Amino acid sequence: EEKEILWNEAKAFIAACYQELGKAAEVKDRLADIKSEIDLTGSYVHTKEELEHGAKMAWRNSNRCIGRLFWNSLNVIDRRDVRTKEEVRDALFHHIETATNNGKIRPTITIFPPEEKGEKQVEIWNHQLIRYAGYESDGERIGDPASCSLTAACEELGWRGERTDFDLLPLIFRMKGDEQPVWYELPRSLVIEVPITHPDIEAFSDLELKWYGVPIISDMKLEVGGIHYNAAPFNGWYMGTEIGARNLADEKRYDKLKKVASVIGIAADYNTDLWKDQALVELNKAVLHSYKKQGVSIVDHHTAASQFKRFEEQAEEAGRKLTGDWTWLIPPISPAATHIFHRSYDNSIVKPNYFYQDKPYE
Amino acid sequence: EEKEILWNEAKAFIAACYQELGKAAEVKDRLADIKSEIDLTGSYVHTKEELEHGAKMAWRNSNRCIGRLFWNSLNVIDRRDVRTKEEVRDALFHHIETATNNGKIRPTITIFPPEEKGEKQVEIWNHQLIRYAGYESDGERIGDPASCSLTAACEELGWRGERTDFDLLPLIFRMKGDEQPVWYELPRSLVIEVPITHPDIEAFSDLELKWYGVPIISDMKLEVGGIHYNAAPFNGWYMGTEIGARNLADEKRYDKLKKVASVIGIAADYNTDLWKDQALVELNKAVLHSYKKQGVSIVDHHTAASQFKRFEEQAEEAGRKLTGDWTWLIPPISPAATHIFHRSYDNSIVKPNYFYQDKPYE
Numbered sequence: 145e146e147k148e149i150l151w152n153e154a155k156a157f158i159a160a161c162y163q164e165l166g167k168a169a170e171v172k173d174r175l176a177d178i179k180s181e182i183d184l185t186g187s188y189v190h191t192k193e194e195l196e197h198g199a200k201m202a203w204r205n206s207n208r209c210i211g212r213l214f215w216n217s218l219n220v221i222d223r224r225d226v227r228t229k230e231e232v233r234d235a236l237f238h239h240i241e242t243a244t245n246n247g248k249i250r251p252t253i254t255i256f257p258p259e260e261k262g263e264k265q266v267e268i269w270n271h272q273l274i275r276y277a278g279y280e281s282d283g284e285r286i287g288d289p290a291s292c293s294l295t296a297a298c299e300e301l302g303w304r305g306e307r308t309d310f311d312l313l314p315l316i317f318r319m320k321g322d323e324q325p326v327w328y329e330l331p332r333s334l335v336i337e338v339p340i341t342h343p344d345i346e347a348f349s350d351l352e353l354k355w356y357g358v359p360i361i362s363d364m365k366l367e368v369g370g371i372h373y374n375a376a377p378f379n380g381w382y383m384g385t386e387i388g389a390r391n392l393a394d395e396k397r398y399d400k401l402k403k404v405a406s407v408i409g410i411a412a413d414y415n416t417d418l419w420k421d422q423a424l425v426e427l428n429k430a431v432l433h434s435y436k437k438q439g440v441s442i443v444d445h446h447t448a449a450s451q452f453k454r455f456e457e458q459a460e461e462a463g464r465k466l467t468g469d470w471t472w473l474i475p476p477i478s479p480a481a482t483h484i485f486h487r488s489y490d491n492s493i494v495k496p497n498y499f500y501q502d503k504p505y506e
Numbered sequence: 507e508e509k510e511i512l513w514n515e516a517k518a519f520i521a522a523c524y525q526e527l528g529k530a531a532e533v534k535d536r537l538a539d540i541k542s543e544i545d546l547t548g549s550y551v552h553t554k555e556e557l558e559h560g561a562k563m564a565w566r567n568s569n570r571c572i573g574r575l576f577w578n579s580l581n582v583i584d585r586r587d588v589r590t591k592e593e594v595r596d597a598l599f600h601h602i603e604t605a606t607n608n609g610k611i612r613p614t615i616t617i618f619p620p621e622e623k624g625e626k627q628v629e630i631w632n633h634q635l636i637r638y639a640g641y642e643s644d645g646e647r648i649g650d651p652a653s654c655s656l657t658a659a660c661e662e663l664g665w666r667g668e669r670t671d672f673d674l675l676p677l678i679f680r681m682k683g684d685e686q687p688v689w690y691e692l693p694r695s696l697v698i699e700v701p702i703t704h705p706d707i708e709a710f711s712d713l714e715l716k717w718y719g720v721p722i723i724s725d726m727k728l729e730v731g732g733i734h735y736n737a738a739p740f741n742g743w744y745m746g747t748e749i750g751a752r753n754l755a756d757e758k759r760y761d762k763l764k765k766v767a768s769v770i771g772i773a774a775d776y777n778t779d780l781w782k783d784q785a786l787v788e789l790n791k792a793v794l795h796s797y798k799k800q801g802v803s804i805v806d807h808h809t810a811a812s813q814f815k816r817f818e819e820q821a822e823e824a825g826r827k828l829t830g831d832w833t834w835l836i837p838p839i840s841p842a843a844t845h846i847f848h849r850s851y852d853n854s855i856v857k858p859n860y861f862y863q864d865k866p867y868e
């Protein structure tokens with residue numbers, strides 16, 4: 145059952161991949177080499193060209209992603225050569241540095257050795273390479289509640305957080321063979337953070353809010369033609385709403401709306417005053433303004449939706465079927481102001497793609 | 507095939523309906539009477555109690571409705587006795603008057619004779635009993651574009667609109683037997699309108715915006731136990747966002763965001779300023795404030811979502827399965843500020859319910 149599946153998926157992938165690359169005639173021979181490799185070894189090794197394009201296709205097929213217009217410019221880093229935890233760590237450090245690019249963020253993926261027999265070579269525990277810790281002890285709520293379980297896991301391994309609201313979690317991953325993961329503190333010089341100020345409300349800085357520059361999702365599995373790259377951290381730049389409308393706004397996250405209303409000088413007493421809505425807008429304006437002032441890449445939800453419209457148009461032109469998840473594609477503020485809201489999307493799964501995996505903690 | 511379906515649906519309805527009313531033992535005999543009636547006549551007649559509760563159940567099963575908490579207090583008007591177009595007209599006039607109730611809106615449904623053999627006794631052309639006309643001629647865009655097709659249809663029948671942005675469409679319905687519908691102008695004394703002002707921005711009134719008090723949907727089919735009430739107009743009170751975020755905001759509707767930005771004194775030049783988002787909030791604040799000042803019932807989306815949460819809780823307590831459409835239940839502004847956004851809903855269809863019908867115009 146195992147080698148069969150790998151062969152079928154590989155057939156579908158190589159055909160489509162080589163077609164797109166204008167390498168249609170090189171298929172049969174490449175498919176031949178692959179079949180012999182599967183027979184003998186139980187798996188196959190992607191060329192750099194297949195891997196790079198497979199990672200790009202996977203982003204293109206990510207139904208929940210509004211930023212897919214730039215799928216073909218993804219910066220792919222091939223690190224299937226790593227064997228040591230020092231190599232993994234430095235690769236992760238490197239990813240952060242080059243993706244950050246002094247603020248002009250490069251969408252980047254670093255690809256580690258794939259699963260062998262379903263056995264993981266490298267297992268990254270971080271949800272994102274850069275993420276704030278979260279604590280709850282005796283009524284006291286500190287940091288990012290979404291990070292509570294991973295934080296406790298890290299502290300079970302000898303890490304200790306300073307217990308600010310913005311403790312940088314350590315990188316934490318487990319190598320094949322080891323019973324426990326290792327953790328490495330993040331060098332502050334690698335991590336860009338953005339203090340949140342408002343363009344015309346001076347008191348906004350009293351909230352002492354900040355967020356990190358680059359969202360680098362590191363717990364999802366990249367699947368390319370039957371090969372499972374369980375460890376392949378990827379990043380884009382933020383859409384402002386992810387920070388202003390969710391990370392800082394959600395009651396189960398930083399829950400800052402009541403404090404925002406206070407500093408912008410409005411009452412938070414009546415639903416009919418729409419104070420949460422007003423606070424959301426000013427906070428989201430602050431986030432966009434702050435990243436722009438510091439020279440860190442970010443996109444507003446209107447511009448992002450426009451770009452996505454072009455992705456839809458580009459897809460139709462290329463003869464490609466379009467897939468998407470309406471419930472994730474709409475922005476969390478003023479979604480009806482975008483074209484996305486006013487149409488429907490086929491939520492079918494197409495491979496290559498990125499998939500959820502079970503957390504090793506929890 | 508026809509009498510079979512009617513019998514099956516009637517079995518399911520009467521059982522559930524009489525169970526809910528604590529009339530469980532009266533089922534068998536009532537089911538008996540119904541089966542004899544179907545055999546002989548080809549259809550059955552609901553009691554006033556069955557009809558009233560069936561209409562209430564239908565609202566309870568409306569997946570796309572956020573205001574379902576008050577399903578059991580629906581004011582049901584039984585007008586299956588109407589035979590003349592003067593009777594229909596006066597029933598519609600009456601519905602408007604009693605539902606409006608001087609501003610303290612009563613959720614109300616008026617039920618007309620149902621389809622006989624699939625033959626309609628009464629066919630209402632209006633989307634809502636109160637709706638603004640729409641025109642497009644030689645570049646000129648006037649009124650509500652969503653009403654363009656019905657407006658042209660009305661004008662094809664001898665009606666003529668004044669061509670303001672807020673022409674009240676006439677009531678228009680067709681009786682069984684007649685080739686054409688009849689139309690009656692709406693008495694202004696029956697229709698409450700609300701001028702849109704802002705609580706602290708005096709210049710907002712310069713937009714000369716207004717909307718009508720009561721949304722009375724009149725083109726949907728009520729289905730109760732196999733009986734098809736194709737003509738059964740129903741109403742609640744508005745949720746503010748329906749007006750401020752959609753009717754007045756959509757580009758394909760009144761498209762007022764750019765003008766709103768102007769009167770509230772903000773630039774509409776850069777997406778990163780989130781001017782559409784800010785305009786949406788102030789406009790939606792204006793709508794809520796305006797209805798409240800005039801003493802016309804309205805609900806904000808936060809309060810409505812809270813009420814819906816109680817509907818969910820009430821449903822669980824009653825042992826009833828909950829159904830809903832996430833894509834319609836979330837409000838079009840700050841949806842992530844509501845609990846609705848953060849959960850999922852089974853979108854299965856349960857009868858009794860309200861259904862779409864083909865427009866006789868178009």
Ligand code: HEM
Binds near residue numbers: 212
């Ligand atoms: C270029 C900048 C990018 C922007 C602005 C962007 C925007 C977004 C946003 C807003 C989401 C929704 C996240 C949420 O609601 O929690 C999302 C989801 C996603 N994006 Fe992108 N994205 C970008 C680049 C990328 C890249 C480079 C990849 C991978 C190659 C990617 C793959 C995904 C995936 C897999 C999801 C779904 C994650 C999940 O299901 O939890 N995106 N994107």
Ligand code: HEM
Binds near residue numbers: 561576614741744
């Ligand atoms: C009591 C006040 C009510 C409020 C605030 C309310 C709120 C809403 C809202 C906001 C929508 C979405 C409309 C849209 O997005 O276009 C909706 C849909 C709906 N409501 Fe209600 N509603 C109320 C009462 C009722 C009543 C009395 C009925 C019928 C007995 C009803 C049945 C429906 C139906 C059938 C839909 C879906 C219409 C469609 O699919 O186009 N609602 N409701």
Ligand SMILES: Nc1ccc2ccccc2n1
Binds near residue numbers: 378379380382386
């Ligand atoms: N802004 C952004 C970029 C990439 C993502 C990948 C997965 C989840 C969220 C993301 N956001």
Ligand SMILES: Nc1ccc2ccccc2n1
Binds near residue numbers: 721741
């Ligand atoms: N506010 C409100 C009440 C009832 C409705 C019925 C159908 C569509 C929209 C509605 N809105």
Ligand SMILES: [Cl-]
Binds near residue numbers: 359386391
């Ligand atoms: Cl994030």
Ligand SMILES: [Cl-]
Binds near residue numbers: 753
């Ligand atoms: Cl409406």
